[PDB]
Amino acid sequence: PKLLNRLNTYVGSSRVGKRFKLAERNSTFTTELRAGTATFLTMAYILAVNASILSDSGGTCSVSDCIPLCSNPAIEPSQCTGPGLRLIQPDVSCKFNPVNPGYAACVEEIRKDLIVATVAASLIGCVIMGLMANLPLALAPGMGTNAYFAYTVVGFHGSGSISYRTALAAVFIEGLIFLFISAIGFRAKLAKLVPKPVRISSSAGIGLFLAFIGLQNNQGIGLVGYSPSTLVTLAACPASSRISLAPVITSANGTVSLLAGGSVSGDIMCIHGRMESPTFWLGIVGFVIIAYCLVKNVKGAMIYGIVFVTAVSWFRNTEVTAFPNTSAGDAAHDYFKKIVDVHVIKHTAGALSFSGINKGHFWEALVTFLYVDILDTTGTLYSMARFAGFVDEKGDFAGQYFAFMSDASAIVIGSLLGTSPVTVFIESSTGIREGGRTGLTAITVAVYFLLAMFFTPLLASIPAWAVGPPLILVGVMMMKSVTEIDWEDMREAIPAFVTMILMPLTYSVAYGLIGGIGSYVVLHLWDWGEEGLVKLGFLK
Amino acid sequence: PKLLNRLNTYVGSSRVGKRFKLAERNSTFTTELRAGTATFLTMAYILAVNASILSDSGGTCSVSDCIPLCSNPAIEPSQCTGPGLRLIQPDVSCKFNPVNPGYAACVEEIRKDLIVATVAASLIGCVIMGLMANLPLALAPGMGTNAYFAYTVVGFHGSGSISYRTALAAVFIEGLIFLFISAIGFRAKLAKLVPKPVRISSSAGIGLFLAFIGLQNNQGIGLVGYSPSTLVTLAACPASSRISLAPVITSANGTVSLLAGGSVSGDIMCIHGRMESPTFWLGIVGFVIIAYCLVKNVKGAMIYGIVFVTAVSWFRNTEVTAFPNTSAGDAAHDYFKKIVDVHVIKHTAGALSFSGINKGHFWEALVTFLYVDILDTTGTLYSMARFAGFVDEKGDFAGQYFAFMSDASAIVIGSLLGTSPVTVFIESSTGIREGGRTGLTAITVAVYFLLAMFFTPLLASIPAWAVGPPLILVGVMMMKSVTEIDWEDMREAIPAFVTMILMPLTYSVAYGLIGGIGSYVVLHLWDWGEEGLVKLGFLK
Ligand SMILES: *[C@@H]1O[C@H](CO)[C@@H](O[C@@H]2O[C@H](CO)[C@@H](O)[C@H](O)[C@H]2NC(C)=O)[C@H](O)[C@H]1NC(C)=O
Ligand SMILES: C/C(=C\CNc1ncnc2[nH]cnc12)CO
Ligand SMILES: C/C(=C\CNc1ncnc2[nH]cnc12)CO
């Protein structure tokens, strides 16, 4: 035969091959390696997107890491000694535009931390799933929950109601609760708790939310900016023609003056040059690359698009550069220069904080995480079992108990490492489509994630317009769930429509879920009361 | 038999009954009256929503109708004579927040004009369709095109690139072109020009656009406001806790000062009291009323919800009042006091302006109007013919030629009266579902619209939170078209997703269409080139 067949037979007939049930499942070693390679190539975009999104949250640092600034920018603080010259003490506004250099350096260190944390949490989840559940499933920080954690629970640069550490405690407790309810068989009852239209359309809502993030500026390619009249219009002007906003006080004659302490925004309003930003068009080229690769069923479509946009942005003196001619850009380029690095999580690891348990926002975030993970993981795991043909007549696929326990454990470990909940990835289907049936697929994906480390300098240099199209296309793939809604029935269409449309518009997964569930409950009050009376016998 | 049967027989056997083919279509007079009544009850929400949306556009008046204001609001301009006191000449900013009282009085006069114009254009379109095409179809200002005309082509208070008069010229020429292409049988070829995913998903995009309008403040119930970080968050704080924004200049230390001439926004940013606006909750109650009425198949659901919210808002000293204790509110209440009035269009009639033909924005608006009307009217008319069983094996329904000519004529007449394009309403199906088969249904709807006049004082008093839920639910009904998209196919899902998501996010129907069509063309370039080469024989 051949050396490849020799290896396959040897591993299949060895103790480790019997542990993973290779012979019992009709695939021994090279199919597992290929399935893991395919799954990793399909899910590798997470290595960029998750760290970018979570770093936008600001990480663990506060105003305590903002450096005092001199009155005039021409004078560095160490030379800020003279007449009429004073250092400005940092306040909360130092976190936002214009961002304090100390806080800007935070986000870079935290982005390195979160790259490593994404890789490590994915590796640990993959290994636990492959060993304890023996399934060809890859686990990684959840794409939908990433944006919710960063921009809703914590907020851009920590502008939300819950701090980053408190949100990590929320994710830790959510993983513990998910593990507990899975261990007692109580997960399916809570899965049936959510209304069907809300459950089905939450995926479409999260997809629209992610796509909207991909069309913003600090998160994606631009193309959506501020409008004084409509609140949103066509952006994609160059960064040099974008301006910030501040709250003002009007009057009955027309006088308008600044509001002290108002939260100034990013450069979101275009004064001219619409549809002329070079980074928007580079992001569009990356979008086209990813879309053709998806159409052609080219595994690694998103990775190829991100890599193209990033490689174009790695040149140093262009208008699409990831390393602008600044101190922050020079430092980012210096880190990028070392192609490989062994970064150690110094900020986000063990950064849990249980201060917010008494706050209602903590429990809103906790419940949203819990139910997103419940519904998502149930649907994905059973879809993957159907793909692998592990589902029997009764509907169980053997290692499901340990599959859900492994997912909950991965969530807890990721919370400890400093990342949003980690979940089983639907992209695992690719590895299942390639013949992966045992846990060796997950071990292969874990080894690929291990190789993803040592390349933090290369992954920390990914600009927003590279994250960009991956977000928009993840939204596109998530929209396919709308077809399962009865749009001719208003009792299902109205709650489903509310769930889809509130997530991007209120910009919050939790608000979309609350609005959809509340509209469902209100619209079914009449039917429920009628049926209750009929049960009591009042009505026939 | 009975007097009703006597009337039915008499009319069916009379000359007018034979003109409308009553006997030939198995319905004589009372079925036509009931079908017209049902169609009117279903489509009567337009009498509020269209005038509200088009008045938000600012109408025909400019800064020329802004009154000069004194330096201090305590002094009326006529008493603005003294030391250090000067009248302020009005500029463009007088149109926006804080809105000049003269310009505020414009919008009220123009809203009366546009109520009358909506009613008159609907009446004329209905009569032309009933007589020249002899179909049970009701025509009225198009719901989708209303918002596009007001908030994109013209802009809130005329902040767009095309003036109101130039946009009316665009609608006039669009109606002329539609009539021309219909008269030469060239309409179906242009209908096949648009890609299938774009054509199908434009309806979902317009629905999302209308729903987003219904969740804004000057247009709907609130619940979506400005966010410095995310550009959109949960609004629905009271108007007393909302503040405006102005562009500012940042620096490298933190200094931020106002930008002279910047376009200040409305009260869109909530400083506190989220989810506490009484008008938001009144709008939610109206939404619940409309949603139950839709669920219960109660004709006139939207009218009932609008009427409830409006009647609650007609009380004078509440936080949800349509007549605040101001000069504008006192005048609005004085007009509302006269329950009936015969208003004469004094501003928007014959207000066409052909100055912008050389502008590219004029032609963008013209083409968007033309293709929205083409696709919409084709789909709706053929759906209505299928409902009425007027479609034969070949696919023609007899009066289709004159149906499309009547629609184009109605568009031209509405442009002359000062309203966005008028279209055949899908709500006509209700009248078709009630047995309406001849043009007497359209004549009945026209008579009901005639009765709608004489109630302009009653219709000009409808607040935003009443328009509100009707917009959101129109979006809900429009979303049902997504199920016709192959979401597993990326060449159809990506263009469809772009079309749906760009309309609310860029806040423009034209941009959604352009983005969707461009993405479709780009994603099919490879296939088209491959097939062209195969035709040339280069490839097998
Ligand atoms: C419009 O009226 C306001 C008062 O409501 C004027 O406010 C001035 O600007 C600030 C705010 O009080 C103070 O420094 C001035 O003393 C205010 N003056 C007065 C007379 O209130 C504002 O100046 C007025 N606008 C114009 C153009 O005169
Ligand atoms: C509802 C949740 C998604 C959370 N994360 C993921 N859940 C399932 N599969 C994935 N592939 C990439 N990310 C994910 C669906 O968006
Ligand atoms: C694509 C266009 C709609 C324009 N107006 C209308 N087009 C067709 N039926 C209707 N009923 C109410 N408004 C309309 C679909 O939103």
Can you offer a commentary on this structure?
Two copies of one chain form a homodimer. Chain A is mainly α. Chain A has one domain (3-70, 86-222, 277-536). The first copy, chain A, is 56% helix and 5% strand. Chain A is built from 22 helices and nine strands. At the A-B interface, strand 1, helix 10, strand 4, strand 5 and strand 6 of A face strand 1, helix 10, strand 4, strand 5 and strand 6 of B. Strand 6 (242-249) of chain A pairs antiparallel with strand 6 (242-249) of chain B. The site of one (2E)-2-methyl-4-(9H-purin-6-ylamino)but-2-en-1-ol has 14 residues of chain B, from helix 7, helix 10 and helix 14. Chains A, B: It is a multi-pass membrane protein.
Which terms would index this structure?
homodimer; binds a molecule of 2 linked components (NAG-NAG); 9 strands; globular; binds (2E)-2-methyl-4-(9H-purin-6-ylamino)but-2-en-1-ol; mainly alpha; two-stranded antiparallel sheet; 540 residues; 3-stranded antiparallel β-sheet
Give a brief rundown of this model:
Chain A is mainly α and 540 residues long. Chain A is built from 22 helices and 9 strands.
